[PDB]
Amino acid sequence: MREVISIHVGQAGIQIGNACWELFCLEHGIQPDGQMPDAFNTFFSETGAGKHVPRCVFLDLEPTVVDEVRTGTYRHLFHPEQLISGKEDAANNFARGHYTIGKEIVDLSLDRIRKLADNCTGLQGFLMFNAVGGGTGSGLGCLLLERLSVDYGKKSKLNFCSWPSPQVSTAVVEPYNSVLSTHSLLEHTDVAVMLDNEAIYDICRRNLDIERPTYTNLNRLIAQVISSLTASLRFDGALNVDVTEFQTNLVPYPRIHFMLSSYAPIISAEKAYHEQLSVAEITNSAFEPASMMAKCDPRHGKYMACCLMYRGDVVPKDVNAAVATIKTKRTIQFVDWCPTGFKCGINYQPPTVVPGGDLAKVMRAVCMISNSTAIAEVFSRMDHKFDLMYAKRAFVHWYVGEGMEEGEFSEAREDLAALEKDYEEVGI
Amino acid sequence: MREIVHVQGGQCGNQIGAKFWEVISDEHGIDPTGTYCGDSDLQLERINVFYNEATGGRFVPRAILMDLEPGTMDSVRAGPFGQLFRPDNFVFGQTGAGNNWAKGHYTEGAELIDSVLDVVRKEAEGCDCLQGFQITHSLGGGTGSGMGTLLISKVREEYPDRIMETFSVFPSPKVSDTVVEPYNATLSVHQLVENADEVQVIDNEALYDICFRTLKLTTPTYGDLNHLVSAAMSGVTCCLRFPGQLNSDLRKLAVNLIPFPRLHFFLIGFAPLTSRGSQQYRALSVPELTQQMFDAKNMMCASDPRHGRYLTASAMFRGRMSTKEVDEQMLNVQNKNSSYFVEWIPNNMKSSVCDIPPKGLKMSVTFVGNSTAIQEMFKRVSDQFTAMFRRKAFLHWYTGEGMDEMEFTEAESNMNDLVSEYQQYQ
Amino acid sequence: SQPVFASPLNVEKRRLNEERALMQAQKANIQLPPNYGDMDLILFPEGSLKNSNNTVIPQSHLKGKSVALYFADGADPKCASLLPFLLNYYRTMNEGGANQKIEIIFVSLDRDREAFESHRAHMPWLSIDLENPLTEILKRHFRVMKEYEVPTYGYGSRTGVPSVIVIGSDGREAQFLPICSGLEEGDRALLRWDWRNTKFA
Amino acid sequence: VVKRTQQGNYVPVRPDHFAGVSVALFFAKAGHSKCAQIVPVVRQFYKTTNFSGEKAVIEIIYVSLDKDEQDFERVRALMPWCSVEYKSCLRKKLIERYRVPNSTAIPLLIVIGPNGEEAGRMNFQQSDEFVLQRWDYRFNKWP
């Protein structure tokens, strides 16, 4: 039918995958057992007596998270060798997960991906969730893109990378893994959506007003974002937009596919019932600069293209009316050479809220994925961090001893600089 | 999975590490007869990291005990949790190295190192794939410093890619028995820098200083010092035994704390630490824990961390907590204490969370940090070494056993280069 | 005669069913002795199964489910190791779905009542008391023995404690789960438990 | 098994009352400082949000970890909402079903859906005290 394959690599990949495969189970009304009491085909297969199994693969070189999914509540939902675990972790080293210990479980990963893509044709594309700052999220992810682009050359690849924040990073080895993975996902990843952890910390602290959130509070928000991107495939709507729909509408140039994200409304229990969630209001709250999900101020950027995914009791006139106000608002600048840069993808189904969560039932919602020239600053931060550390070869001998030469550090430096120059010259 | 082989040598290494197995078995719920009690799965799902099934259901530690005299081996066996160990894993001497590194390493320790290499080959090869080794010993003495470091040199030749971290008790600052102390220390240090991936330093006057202000113990015996060491000792492997939101094993820690290969000497701290009286009057929150473990008087080395710069450091949090407030606070320490850190490394600090806090608490953190303030240690041992080496004092017990004069100069050349290498980075 | 012929339970089965056949033949070209398929027994009588805090649960509530006997001991370290895995398995498996699928009936090999209550205080599934002679006739039927002390009629020790045996309606073993058996897969043999096919009808 | 306090005595609850509304159980214990902290706050919140309107919107079933009939009757004598019966097996069934360790766990509100399985978890052993209203009583109403 219209199937997509979600690949989860690394601890952030697995733990984001727990939230999205909780939400998709609840949305299509299937149980943790796997059977419900054909719109679910985009995310679930069929196995005999009504069991629907997810079209996902779990990859992590370290047992302590994938094994603990097997023992947890969702035992029988996932197929037993759709969850692949190694023996020793990559341990925050890109060279380990790419050369020495990565290669052992790559062939196991491709075997399950091959067996899951050959079930039916009409494969719509691949999704991948990974941590750039981690070891196997960068290491095993780069190998897995390289050996998927050669085989399934035609298909789209949508990446959702948990990029390290400017202030908080929880690693000194993360500037190395960030700039070494950017040379990976320039020429293999089709469209990359840029995620930042403490941006979501700030969203869940002033919008929904949790003072002390955690990783299972951010991952629900990511799950609602992914559900909004793929809502159009699953359910019927006024204007359907696939995953092939996104590459032709957001990236104008081959090397420029780095884009932000936004959700509205991120609203709590008390706030939601007391407020009109107008179609004008949720769009205005989406374009608010701090309400983006990347910690990247867009006022010092130019919007190249922008897609709006509406979800709920949304009529098309209010969409047309609200977005005209946005364009005539003076604060946000649009690039001169792109006169039309907005999408209306309107879907009928309201967002299904996980009970015990933190969001409320809202009648309508909007999720924005915008390609902007504000990505220059978020690379300039990681570039300056890499220049300080590599000035005196700190933490380099760990990389050299595992097989990576000295010189991939050199060449990935101007590759990021070549990316940085392109975003400067496109803003002319 | 992975198993940490525990190799235990000398009087200190047995005595502080026998009560290491007091604490690990308590957390994992092991009856001293080896059976399990405690009716939960989280302990027992990852127990082969430190134990072995013994076809009768009992869990034996994968631990090896070394000494050149049978005195402290009798005492470890005779205490509580003495029957846990396998009697075969004991390896005994009959003579004993009288505070002499030469007869610990060259002469008398050679006839025993073949037997203890045999037992470490049996219980490291028989597993699936080991992660590394954990060696616990002292430096002032003979059997721990000498014959322990011989095993480090032997195993590093045999297994050249497994991690090798050491819970080493360095010499004392001020009050010291074993008058030939810096000879054994300096010789062990220059052999530690070539074979040990991580070294974690412990001082006794550090531990005496902890239990005089914080824990308020008037009469601290040697048992409670080991209980304090074994508390931060078991915290290094929280990520291995229990699941957590952000895991960090030993190889995680090595790549994250060691910028340059020769400098791998760390600094251990643990929090919280309160007296029994003021146990119930405190607010155990991550502001309070982080202030507790960034304090000079909470470390387990009596060398001032305000007199140097933290190159890199890591905190491994235990307990159900908030990942935002552990991330903001661990950046809150860097924003004020910028003059205490180094500038060419952005965000010196590491966060990792284990969901199972230690027993009887609800939140804990262990701090291990690569600080250049540790150079006050190696200067202190070097100038004591230099004073005792110009006069050629006490050399005749070392030259007599079959050790040459030249490696004494070599050891001093190594630590002066180790001191100078730390001095470049301040 | 499944899985054994020399069982006390099978002897009792054959006596009652063949007595029924004789009485029917006397009342009325009927097969004497009766076929083993046509022999029927009631396995757990009304006073056998007791749930948590001692309330009688009849055999009627075991219908349409996968039922396994847990032959267990108190001080056996293998039993103490296997217990938390089976607790987690039971809890997760029963939460995973609208209806509850598996049940465990506990057969004790403990020394005395204090050990019985101390061990059974953990367990949430059903348990057969130590004094009821069912706890020894089922033991002899499914060939469980801590040590070779029972007069055993040319059997082999099919299992040692701990063991779980999936039972059928008429006492036939649905499947052996190999913890201490020919496969020797401890605490991971529980995943081999299939529950479509081994329904207690 | 579930009782309601009226003027003078106790009455068994009507199962038709729990429908059309939202349901939370309150795991607590008499004699605890945090339970004495939290009980009157939830009391005033309950009476405000249930008498500010025509129809009731929430109800609370109180479950106790007390070891004494005297303390159980003591808290039931002044707590306005529902309660469970002390000797009924449902109290221990709810404990082992919902994992309260019997401290840093009490008090607790577990909001429950219609099929007996939870719709929310909420604790008070934390700095924030404005968390009572973070539970939506309009997405999750029983049929």
């Binding site: 727990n18 909780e22 609840l26 009304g29 149980q31 943790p32 603990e68 999914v69 947890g72 509540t73 969702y74 955690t214 990783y215 299972t216 299904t352 996980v354 009970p355 015990g356 | 308590d26 719920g29 405690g38 939960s40 989280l42 302990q43 229990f242 699941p243 957590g244 939101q245 307990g319 159900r320 969901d355 199972i356 806090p357 027993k359 009887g360 | 939460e95 995973g96 | 994992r99 360790p101 401290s103 766990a105 859906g113 219609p114 099929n115 399985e117 939870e118 719709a119 978890r121 999750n140 049929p143």
Partner: peptide, 22 residues
């Protein structure tokens, strides 16, 4: 003189069964 065990993993606490919408 031991103590009982009162800690559960974060996955086991936040990822349980969940009531389906009608």
């Amino acid at each position: 003189p031991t103590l009982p065990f009162n800690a559960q993993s974060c996955y086991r606490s936040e990822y349980v069964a969940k009531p389906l919408p009608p």
